Design a binder for these strands. Sequence first.
RNA 1: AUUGAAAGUUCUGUUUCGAAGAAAACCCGCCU
DNA 2: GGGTTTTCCTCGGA
Lengths: 204, 317, 317, 317, 312, 183
Amino acid sequence: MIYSKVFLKLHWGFSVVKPLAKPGFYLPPPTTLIGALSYGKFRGVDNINLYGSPAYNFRNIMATARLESEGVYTEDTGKVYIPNGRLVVVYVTISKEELEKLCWSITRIGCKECLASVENVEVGEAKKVSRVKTRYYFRDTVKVVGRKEFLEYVTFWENGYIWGKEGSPVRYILPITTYPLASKEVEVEAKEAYEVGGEYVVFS
Amino acid sequence: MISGSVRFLVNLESLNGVESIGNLTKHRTAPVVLKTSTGYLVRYVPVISGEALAHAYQASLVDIAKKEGLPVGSLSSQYEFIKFSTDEALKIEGIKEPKDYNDARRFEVEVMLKDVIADVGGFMYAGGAPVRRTSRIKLGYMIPALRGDEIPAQLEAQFHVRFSNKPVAIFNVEVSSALYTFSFELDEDLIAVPSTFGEKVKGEEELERQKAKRVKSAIKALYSLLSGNFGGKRSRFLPSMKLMSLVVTKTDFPFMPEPAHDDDYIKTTIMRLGKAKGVLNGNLAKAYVINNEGIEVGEGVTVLSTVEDLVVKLEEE
Amino acid sequence: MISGSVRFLVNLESLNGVESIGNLTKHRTAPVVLKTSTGYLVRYVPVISGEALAHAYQASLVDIAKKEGLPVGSLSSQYEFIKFSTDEALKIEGIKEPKDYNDARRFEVEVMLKDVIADVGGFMYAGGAPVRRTSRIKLGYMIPALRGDEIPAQLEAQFHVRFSNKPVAIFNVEVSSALYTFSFELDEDLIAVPSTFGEKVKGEEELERQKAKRVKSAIKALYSLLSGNFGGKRSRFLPSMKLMSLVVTKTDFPFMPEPAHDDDYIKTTIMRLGKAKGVLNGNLAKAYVINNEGIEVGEGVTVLSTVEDLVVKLEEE
Amino acid sequence: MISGSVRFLVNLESLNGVESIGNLTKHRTAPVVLKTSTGYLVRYVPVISGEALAHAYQASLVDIAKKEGLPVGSLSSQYEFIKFSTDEALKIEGIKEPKDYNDARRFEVEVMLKDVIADVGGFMYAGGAPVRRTSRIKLGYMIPALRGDEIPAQLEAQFHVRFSNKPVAIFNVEVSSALYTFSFELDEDLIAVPSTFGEKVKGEEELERQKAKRVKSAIKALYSLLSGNFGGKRSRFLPSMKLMSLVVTKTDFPFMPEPAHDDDYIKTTIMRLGKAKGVLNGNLAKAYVINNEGIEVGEGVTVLSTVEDLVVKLEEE
Amino acid sequence: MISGSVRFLVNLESLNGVESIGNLTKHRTAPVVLKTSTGYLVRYVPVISGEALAHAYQASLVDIAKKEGLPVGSLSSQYEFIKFSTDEALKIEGIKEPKDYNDARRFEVEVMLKDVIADVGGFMYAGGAPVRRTSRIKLGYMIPALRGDEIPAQLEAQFHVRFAIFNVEVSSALYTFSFELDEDLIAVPSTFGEKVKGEEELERQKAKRVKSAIKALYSLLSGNFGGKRSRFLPSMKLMSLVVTKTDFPFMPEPAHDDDYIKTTIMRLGKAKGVLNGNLAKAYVINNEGIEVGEGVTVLSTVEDLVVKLEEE
Amino acid sequence: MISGSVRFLHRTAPVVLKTSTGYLVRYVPVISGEALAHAYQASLVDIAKKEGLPVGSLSSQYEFIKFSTDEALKIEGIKEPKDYNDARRFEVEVMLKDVIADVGGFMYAGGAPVRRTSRIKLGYMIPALYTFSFELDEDLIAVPSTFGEKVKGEEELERQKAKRVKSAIKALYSLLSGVVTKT
RNA sequence: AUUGAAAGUUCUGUUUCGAAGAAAACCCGCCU
DNA sequence: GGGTTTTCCTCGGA
């Protein structure tokens, strides 16, 4: 499994709005992360017959991200403010050319006003291991060490790209401090996890 | 496409108000955390939303298109950007709702031939057969630049009185002064191109003829935004805006320059533009820089003076 | 539209007041963000609101309209600019309230047929059918020039007492000196023209006949602002005012002149005006300059000597 | 209206005082913003408030009114200008308080029928039905001329002691020298005319009969200000005063003469007066000039020699 | 009222002193703003305060009052013009303090019945019931004439030793000054109130008080006011003098310019016309041969002026 | 009051002189009046010694420090004053021994300062040929200038008043040698 | 092309009217 | 040897 790492800047922040009062999500779901990658190849088409969103075929690109600064949550329509901050994204899955060419062209993470940016990337080969230290968020059934104090429970969606259809409800644990927003590390003893560039990743 | 990042300086302004309490009208602010040796400090800084910028840009485009002889919707000429969203707007305008999915394209082009703003601005009609369209200009929030260890922004209240001869007349207004920066993108290559997949429908040749004029008008509409013709309360509170720095990249591949929140954002964006061009096999990459605060630039750029030359060079290429 | 920027030098003035504490009367102050060689700083400077400027302009317009023969409202003959905002004002003047949206236009026409102030300076009525009319003259706060590193302004307090024969009477007044700068905009192409969309209503012929007189009166009313009779506390604190620099542009397209913060804001404005006329396909663009401080202006620009000549030239053209 | 500007040369004067510290009596000082070839600077100069000028004018008006035969209030015969402000003053004079808004006119008429000072210099009553009357004479601070790069003013302190035969008595007094300039305005078209809106009230016939006498007294009272008997500390610090330049304009329309900061403020004022009469459709505009320092004046302007001639000419016309 | 302006020529004088530094005694100096053909300038010139003039005038008034027979206070017989300012002075003289505002008038009358100086030169008492009386004679600083472009004044220092070393500042100047004296309020209370017993004596003595006040001006017009007179006797002489007697307020022109007599006369006539006056007379003493005018009384000495002022 | 003016036929001082053209500032040689005062007092001592008028011990030699410093009082044996009331006594206690302190004045600074201004007044010499003026108060010789209760010793001063005024009149001959009015 | 697509909280308004830090006071008494 | 003494420190309409 090849992989690519990328560093990102954000001009003002991301403002993904919860579906179903307009609360907002603390950290963007992977659906936005894969749509930002699909933007590179599917520019110009806002609707293609599957009708639904054009990024209905990029559902096998499993990848994650995490923050590397301090941010705030605001409601004035839930939003997250982290101007001039950093965001690291790890793509782990098509050949290296696809990832390294779609990844250098990443724009507009989230809403149209939630402009994003790409700083630098790198490429390599990943390795699979099953006690590792990670930072990126993961699913709910993943097991954590004896201490549990800095975890938030969030609801996310899987097969919901088709408009007019409801996304699947899945719980996902983000190791996050609610106020102020930051990321905290957690050793994991699970069955399915991946190591990438020293920074270990946990999946299930 | 075209991308840009701009740094402004505004004093004594009230350009975005919020819900009023009592006799006081309040400004819009956002929380930011500043790092200190002792710890962290949470502060509130005045901001300007992007909806006002979008409204100003759309109004300027409406005026330019009307002056240049292009179709404009009946409800759009009245500075009411409701757009062809509900059934009543179509009933007023005189457009038939889409029949099914396969004919959806037929609808879209028709809407594109009655209202130019329904193309650059983009529309979203709801109903049993929804149709989608994305704005061809993307704008971000106008926020102060978090530079160094201090925030150069403020917010005070002002007390105003109405005079009368038979007293039986007091209000308060919030005023601010900050250092605003914001960035934008414009994808001119997708102008007049239908965005619904399917077979071609008769009526695209006129769009081919009108592509040049529509692109020219869309580029011209940037002058209003870059000259400071947005916001509210301008009748009595007229702000004193000024331009400090600006970087604009003309490319042929997706790209976004770095934000102007650091004291050096021109050199780094040049370096990453070169790297991105090398990676993505790019043949078109030009940089336009306006500098008034005397920050470092680098090499490989064209030095401009004002905003008009920027629009001229954007139109030419 | 007629736009302009202007500088003033004011010494020993108390023209705008705020709530007093104890026996001290306070002068209005506001924050400003200023750029120095060491970065960006936040300072506090005395300011003058634009409400007083608007009030003085409207009072002069009332006087000129009554002298010429244009209609003036009952509550406007007395200098109380409540206009047609509350039900009491309509009851006093004698105009029925709008019934619904379709009637709103008629109401506006009637309001324009009785008071020139509600036509030029705009008005607002809140109720079942709200009616809005934006002012055709736009002003802003009067701010000391943010030039260089040192702000040329100062504020202090002064001691006063009242004489008596049986002591049984002491107060303090804030006094400021500054180099104020401000800009204004006046669109004369919409005077005596309804801004509410609808159908033709009887009585617009009189408005069309009187449009020239209304435009002339609106242009003449600017002499009060350009001469300097706006501030209060004029009985015992008569300010010493003089003119330093003034630029006025008459155009057929939107345009905003450079603020008077920097010493070089006339030549930049002229170059921007020429380039904007080229860009926007304009047909008329004229500039007038009054200079007394001996700064650079440029070439091929009309130069005046006083303000009355400017008023005459604006009226004639 | 009668407007004017005037210059004075005062040497070795202490005419306005502030709170003293220790054994030092302080002369009033204020900041000024002055323009030099190197830019703009802030300086500190001695100043004289306009309250003393108003007090001297009102005292001279009391004297002239008593000599002629015009009514003078009880508390105004004694030189205590509290006027009809507090309840004690009304109780002493013997005038009932206003009941409501409708009665205010009556109150004003009665106050104008007993004291000339409350008619010319204006008055204020605060209470359930506040009554205001703006002064018909307007004055300002007496400021040294801000001409060139060097201010022609100076301030120091002087040492004084009291003799005694059995020592067991030392003080310091601030003394200043300056070239003062100031301007004044007096509208004689509203003397003995109520400023409160309402209905006709019995007793106005006497006001109409006495209007000529009141106007004559008000015009004559300006001799005290134009001669220079206003300041305090006159027993042992008799100032040395002389006249340098004076311009007076009598018009039927509002007009403000140029301040006396620059050497060329007479010719500019005359040209501005002519152009303003042309612009505003006036019917009367006359200028009088008294010159002793040999500066440029112009042509076709009446020239005088003393101040009494000016007073006589103002009375006759 | 009797107003006037006068010029003096003083040479080799040290009449007013300030705090000394080291072994140097300093002459008082002050700044002046003067107009030249090149604009306006600021200069420093020696000056003499008006406090010495007032002290000399009051001392001469004490002498004349004692000679004539008018009452003089205990602390005023000795030349210490503290007047009735502090509690010690009242205790020495023997006058009770005012109780409240209503009694103040009585107090003033009593103060006017014992000391002529507190009546003519005014007085001030600070306390529970402060009492004020402005002086009826007004004076000012003695300033060299600000004429032309060059100030006719000079100041230097001189060396002296004892047979022990010191330095003394000496100045020469052409001094000018003006004065005003309202004789219509002498021996008339200035405090508002009701009639108080004892005013009949004031009415009887009003003529004598006015005569003494007029005669007291001889000290100022002759030039016996300054200190350091034992070894630095100034050389003084008269150059020009104008005196106006009127029934209305009027201020004569200062002696800065050579033409200040004819201007004063014309202004006096026009002001009499404007203000509806009834009496206006002018007296001129001229020795420097400047323009005066026509139809103006000319004198020769100062005693004649004093006599004429007394008689009329 | 004896007064008058005298005419006769290097330190320099300024003068403000008057000419037909107007006013001028010039520099001329001058002589201070303290020298004339010293000469006059020396001649007064010389004349007084010719009669029974007392002459101070320190003033016997031509050194006119009078009684300014405590050293002169100690060498002449006169007690310092105790309070203000004693002042007059001190005054006569120094008028009964020297005629110079009486005529030309004197002082003593301290806890109880004592002052006596000069009865003779003089000034600088300015060329016209030099001209100058003087002033002599003939009415206040041997008259105690201090105010207070009478103290013993005034009778001797009343007796010697005629001789003292005669000496004061005579002593001007020194300055006269190198117009007079009397009341 | 992402619960993404479409959206100005905008319009109208003087902190205004009025009131002296004022009265009393020597750097002056001898020095080559 | 003296290097300052009192007297008042905002009244109202929204």
